[PDB]
Amino acid sequence: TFQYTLEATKSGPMTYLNKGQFYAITLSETCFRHPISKVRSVVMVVFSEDKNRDEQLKYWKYWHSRQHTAKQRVLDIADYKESFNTIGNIEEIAYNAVSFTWDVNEEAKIFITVNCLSTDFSSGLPLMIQIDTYSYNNRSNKPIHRAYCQIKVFCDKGAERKIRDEERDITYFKTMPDLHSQPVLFIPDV
């Protein structure tokens, strides 16, 4: 039914990202007829190991306390026209999540960045990008589709250096069979 891609450095799905560098995510629907065209997707940065909720909010507060500004988010979205013409209703619902609506009859394009290094949760944690797709025609707490992509976030072009060291373009997200489980989203006290 649905399919998402991440345009990054080539490494289920695992991708190496550089902190503060924007990467293109594409949202597409592989059943819909006007006016039934829109869906609402949630792009998140959550932990892979599936630790308890309280553990996950512990790593986020530790990370958040070590930032130079309280306004610093884990996940950020770029305002580029290529993206903003294809998507609507952009909401920064949490520090590690972005919400937007997109038309299934088109292909959605977003540029995102991860501002946490995989090594920032100790003095490397398996992180992942999760995409939740919801119906726009109901207030259900259950997505119609889920998909993930494991990520490793580096600094100073570390992603390229890791690939280069391994040696010495598009990654498809893997569909998550559980629509019941809830992602741990972080919002600090401001």
Side-chain angles (χ1 to χ4, degrees), residues 51-67:
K51 296 298 183 180
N52 83 32
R53 175 166 198 93
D54 299 305
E55 308 185 46
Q56 298 203 27
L57 293 162
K58 281 171 198 171
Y59 308 133
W60 291 131
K61 292 278 216 191
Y62 171 80
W63 177 80
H64 190 63
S65 55
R66 293 213 178 277
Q67 300 312 296

Side-chain angles (χ1 to χ4, degrees), residues 47 49 117-122 124-127 151-153:
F47 305 94
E49 276 174 324
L117 309 174
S118 285
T119 64
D120 278 357
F121 299 99
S122 207
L125 259 69
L127 283 154
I151 69 164
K152 277 191 189 162
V153 183

Side-chain angles (χ1 to χ4, degrees), residues 85-143:
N85 291 339
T86 182
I87 299 176
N89 301 286
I90 301 137
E91 298 178 5
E92 297 181 337
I93 59 158
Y95 272 45
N96 61 329
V98 176
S99 188
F100 57 94
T101 61
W102 61 288
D103 181 356
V104 297
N105 300 115
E106 302 165 59
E107 201 175 289
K109 218 179 191 199
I110 53 155
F111 302 89
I112 57 93
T113 195
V114 192
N115 300 304
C116 60
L117 309 174
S118 285
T119 64
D120 278 357
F121 299 99
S122 207
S123 44
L125 259 69
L127 283 154
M128 75 180 181
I129 297 167
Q130 194 177 303
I131 305 177
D132 276 11
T133 296
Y134 292 89
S135 166
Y136 196 59
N137 300 284
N138 69 43
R139 302 203 78 229
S140 176
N141 47 305
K142 293 316 164 61

Side-chain angles (χ1 to χ4, degrees), residues 27-44:
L27 303 181
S28 61
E29 193 288 329
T30 304
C31 180
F32 302 89
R33 186 175 299 272
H34 302 277
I36 307 308
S37 55
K38 295 179 176 57
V39 292
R40 178 186 60 95
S41 301
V42 184
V43 178
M44 310 151 268

